[PDB]
Write a protein that binds this DNA or RNA. Structure first.
Ligand SMILES: [Zn+2]
Lengths: 133, 97, 50, 88, 52, 52, 84, 50, 122
RNA sequence: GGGCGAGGCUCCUUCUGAGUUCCCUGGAACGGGACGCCACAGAGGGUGAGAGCCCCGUAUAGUUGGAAGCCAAGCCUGUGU
RNA sequence: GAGACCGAUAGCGCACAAGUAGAGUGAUCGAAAGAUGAAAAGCACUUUGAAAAGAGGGUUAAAUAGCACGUGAAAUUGUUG
RNA sequence: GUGAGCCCGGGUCGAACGGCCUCUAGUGCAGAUCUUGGUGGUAGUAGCAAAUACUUCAAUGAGAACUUGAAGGACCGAAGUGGGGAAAGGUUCCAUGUGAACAGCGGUUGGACAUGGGUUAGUCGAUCCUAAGCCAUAGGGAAGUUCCGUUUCAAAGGGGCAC
RNA sequence: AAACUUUCAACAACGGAUCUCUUGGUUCUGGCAUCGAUGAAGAACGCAGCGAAAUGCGAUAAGUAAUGUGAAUUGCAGAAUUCCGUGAAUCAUCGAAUCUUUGAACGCACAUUGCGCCCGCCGGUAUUCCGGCGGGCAUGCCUGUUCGAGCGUCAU
């Protein structure tokens, strides 16, 4: 149960915020879990997804397919995975939109900022566990 | 005897804000106590007798102590409101009691 | 894509073509129940129309 | 002939465009706008027309300056720059 | 809202030979013109005994 | 016209004997600048303006 | 364009008489003569003095309008007023 | 008329530049609900009101 | 080309910034003619030239205003654009010193009988 | 009469628990069955159908970094023109 | 931040490029109008037509969802019995 | 089931809903020349009859009385069915292309629809002048929005000269 | 017997009711005090590679600077991002700026892009002519400065 007066449990306000969120908020909204190996390596459960990550689809009709993230259509709240496509009528290839909560990240596209994100998440989790323990 | 011959609907006051106003008053009192600590939240008041023949049986708190009361108690009139004592220069002591 | 866009532009005209508008600029709303034809009484003096 | 034939003589203009409010309400002979009351200093408004007041009230236009005032109040009308910010 | 159904200018067209005597929206050039108003039986009108 | 001829001289070293102006129905101004006879307008349009 | 009027350009704008210059600077005659000596403002001669001023004689003194405009900015004017 | 003021001609210029159908790429945007120009004007239908 | 970063502009002074503004304006003027004569990827270049001109103008204005604020640091009257904005009512408000000024009789009373700190035994 | 002032409060900032385990229906499990886990969090929303444990958030103590004020235990000092 | 409120003829006139379109010389007056599908996968290719389209053949879980698009009542109409 | 109604089968459909006891109301329709929306018979009906009038060949095109060229026949008849303007409109002008809608019949045509093009001045107007008239100022009214006032009961400014 | 009219049924029409949905209304509660001559509210006209509107913005024009975040935008086109970074974005924040013509609206006017005046700077053969650019010029009132007027009261 929510306690804080700044927290609203209004369904109307929640849906308005979700479907009118700006791009930086949508980046946080399209987060994906890490694989078990990455979770034990980094002590991180979930991260915002980005182009160049390698994912495994665990839900839907394209389950167990693997590939790299080729596009993050934040306007459609969807990601595109290479070779997870379908055929149009005309015989051309069109990407299939996958929600990032239906995939699991198996390889991270790493740079300095991503390492900073992972490090500060790990440090916060350890600090919280130490304080509550 | 119903007085509804004016445009009474423009001047209807409901009181849905009664618990909210109680909460606001309690928050203001807690803030005042925290600002005044360790002083008491209120000033000392004298005991006075109510006027008229209906209410002269009963005593109550008055506005403030008289100048002659402060003089007989040895508290200067400039010191008294700085140590939590209310002062009333209008009230007089007509009787000794 | 050009063929799809042209088809969508043609499909956008179906309601106004059923309403028989001369293009999209024709938005005139006519008086179907005019007051001069649906109110008042014809008296013995001056009349409103011949 | 007070109807259709008389309507053919309508080719003058009682009102032109007002410079202050943009409506075709500036009386060309009196030089007074019927809508906004130009060239009087005050803008014409009346309490017998709540609709007319709400058509022109504050917030129905652009609020080019007034829309930025609540943010400056929230930050306390501060001046200067963040510490260490690039610049002059 | 206390103003619901009453933000219109409308007058009855009088007793005649054609239409019912409900007040009707004045003007022209729009669908609202000539339509009934203010009644609890009218579309876009004030409800009977508005809640207070 | 004076501003137009000064701008043409400043930008392209173009000298004009006269300039005629009109305002187009779209709201932009059009200027016909007749050059001095010693200078070739076709040469200017080919090199400076690239109008071939 | 609009037709120009006579006497609004040329020498009539180029020259001023001494009376016009003194009234323009709002000075007394001794202060004006002193300032002209000190700043090097010299008498001038138009080709036709009637085009400058119809009441001018052979003893009328002329100056350049631009020279009088330049004298408008000299800091000694405020010094004169301060001493007065 | 041929005789017109600068302000009137400027307003007529703005109306001429506004008088167009919508670009066809608008209908292909994601979540588009614009199907035609609902404010399109014609010289026979609706007056500018100047 | 045509993309000028703010970081390199913040170290220049007025003359090279003016020179850069001149070259950018010349390139944009030529590129508009290139646009109306042919179509290509040069529209990206005209967009970058427009934004670069905006950046150069911003930096020149900021440096000029900083120099003027340094010049007017110790003067009683400042230009109206350099004065703080606040609101009109805030500018008309009495100053803190003037609002805190008290009479001398009040000052004597406050010096010798201020509000004391006290507690009352229960 | 002056000057310090421990500490506290207000505001933005970093961070927070637990299943996408197995079977069936299904285009898609967020449904049914089984076995677990978290809970100061079983408010709300999203995700291909009713999701505490998939994702954002939610609860509680705190924990990073910054700015401007206010209150304040006490402590140094001048002394009477 | 909420509700024993209303759920597209309701609820603000306005859930939509609504004080808009439109009307009036003018003051003023002032609407109608939401919903394919999880995903456009919005029909390749063949064929008949000048074309609109039709028929095959496809997409889809479903076209008995075809940008006239969820469901699809009645008045009223066509065919068949 | 006396009844208002309740329950089930079959078809369609796609995401929520019901029973029981209490609580609550914007709670039950055939009428109101009721409101809004939709739809019939009338009915393939009334009608599409002022302004004298059309015809032949060829081309274009899926399709030609109302497109074009040529060939004929007519009409306006200089107070025109001609050539140009003022008001009003505002791109209707010109070229090219065109499905539907509109042009009360048709349409290859169009003032329709789509994309483009087009308006060049020291001498033509505006701009300047004043007319009937209107509005500031001085000043006086008015609770006031403002009213009068336009030469006034106003210190309402120009020129020249100077050792 | 058919046709026609009417009745009953199935399917197909017409039309948009019903059901479910809801980034919207409505009502209550809590918090806060902040428009403008330093030119507001309102109006007009413009600005995107490809927009008419809505939205955003002002010739620095779907934006500039700064701070933060950390890889998009997306309908098409075209470019990205040294990804181990002075850095994508129709991102967020927002303390620095820009802010056309107007409008209480202020040189006089405005049914005119009409007519001026003052002071600078630049260019064109230019002491005179022509052009461009910059800064100014409303009213009432207050404090002060300075220049004045009147046998109004005086001194000498
Ligand atoms: Zn006006």
């Amino acid at each position: 149960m929510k306690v804080r007066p700044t927290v609203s449990s209004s369904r109307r306000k929640a849906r308005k915020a979700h479907f009118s969120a700006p791009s930086s908020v949508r980046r946080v909204i399209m987060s994906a879990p890490l694989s078990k190996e990455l979770r034990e390596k980094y002590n991180v459960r979930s991260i915002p997804i980005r182009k160049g990550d390698e994912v495994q689809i665990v839900r839907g009709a394209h389950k167990d397919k693997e590939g790299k993230v080729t596009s993050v259509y934040r306007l459609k709240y969807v990601i595109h995975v290479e070779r997870v496509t379908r055929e149009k009528a005309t015989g051309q290839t069109v990407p299939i939109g996958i929600h990032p909560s239906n995939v699991v990240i198996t390889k991270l596209h790493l740079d300095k900022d991503r390492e900073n994100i992972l490090a500060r998440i790990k440090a916060g989790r350890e600090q919280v566990a130490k304080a509550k323990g | 005897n119903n007085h509804f011959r004016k445009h009474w609907q423009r001047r209807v006051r409901c009181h849905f804000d009664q618990p909210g106003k109680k909460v606001t008053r309690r928050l203001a009192r807690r803030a005042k106590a925290a600002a005044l600590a360790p002083r008491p939240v209120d000033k000392l008041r004298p005991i006075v007798r109510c006027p008229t023949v209906k209410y002269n049986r009963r005593t109550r708190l008055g506005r403030g102590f008289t100048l002659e009361e402060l003089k007989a108690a040895g508290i200067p009139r400039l010191l008294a409101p700085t140590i939590g004592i209310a002062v009333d220069h209008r009230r007089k002591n007509l009787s000794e009691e | 894509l050009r063929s799809k866009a042209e088809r969508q532009a043609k499909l956008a005209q179906r309601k106004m073509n059923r309403m028989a508008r001369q293009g999209e600029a024709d938005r005139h709303i006519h008086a179907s129940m005019p007051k001069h034809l649906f109110s008042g009484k014809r008296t013995i003096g001056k009349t409103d129309r011949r | 002939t007070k109807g259709t034939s008389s309507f053919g003589k309508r080719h003058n203009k009682t009102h032109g465009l007002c410079r202050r409010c943009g409506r075709r309400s500036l009386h060309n002979q009196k030089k007074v706008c019927a809508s906004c009351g130009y060239p009087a200093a005050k803008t014409r408004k009346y309490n017998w027309s709540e609709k007319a007041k709400r058509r022109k009230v504050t917030g129905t236009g652009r609020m080019r300056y007034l829309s930025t005032v609540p943010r400056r109040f929230k930050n306390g009308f501060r001046t200067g720059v963040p510490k260490g910010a690039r610049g002059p | 809202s206390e103003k619901a159904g009453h933000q219109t200018s409308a007058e009855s067209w009088g007793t005649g030979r054609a239409v019912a005597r409900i007040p009707r929206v004045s003007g022209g050039g729009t669908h609202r013109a000539g339509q009934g108003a203010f009644g609890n039986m009218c579309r876009s009108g004030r409800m009977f005994a508005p809640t207070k | 016209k004076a501003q137009i001829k000064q701008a043409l001289k400043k930008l392209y070293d173009i000298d004009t004997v006269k300039i005629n102006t009109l305002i187009r129905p779209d709201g932009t101004k059009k200027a016909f600048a007749r050059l001095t006879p010693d200078v070739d307008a076709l040469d200017i349009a080919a090199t400076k303006l690239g109008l071939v | 364009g609009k037709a120009k009027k006579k006497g609004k350009s040329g020498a009539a704008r180029n020259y001023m008489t001494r009376t016009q210059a003194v009234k323009k600077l709002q000075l007394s005659l001794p202060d004006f003569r002193k300032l002209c000596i000190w700043k090097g403002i010299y008498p001038r001669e138009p080709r036709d003095r009637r085009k400058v001023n119809k009441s001018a004689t052979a003893s009328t003194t002329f100056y350049y309008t631009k020279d009088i405009q330049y004298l408008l900015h000299e800091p000694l004017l405020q010094k004169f007023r301060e001493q007065k | 008329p041929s005789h017109k003021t600068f302000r009137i001609k400027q307003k007529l210029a703005k109306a001429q530049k506004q008088n167009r159908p919508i670009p066809q790429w608008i209908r292909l945007r994601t979540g588009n609900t614009i199907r035609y120009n609902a404010k399109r004007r014609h010289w026979r239908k609706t007056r500018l009101g100047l | 080309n045509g993309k000028v970063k703010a970081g390199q502009l913040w170290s220049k002074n007025k003359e090279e910034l003016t020179k850069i503004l001149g070259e950018l304006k010349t390139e944009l003027s030529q590129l508009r003619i290139q646009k109306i004569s042919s179509s290509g990827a040069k529209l990206n270049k005209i967009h970058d030239l427009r934004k670069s001109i905006a950046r150069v103008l911003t930096v020149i204005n900021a440096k000029q205003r900083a120099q003027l604020r340094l010049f007017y640091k110790n003067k009683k009257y400042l230009p109206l654009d350099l004065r703080p904005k606040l609101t009109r009512a805030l500018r008309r408000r009495l100053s803190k010193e003037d609002a805190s000024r008290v009479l001398e009789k009040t000052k004597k009373r406050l010096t010798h009988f201020p509000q004391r700190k006290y507690a009352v035994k229960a």
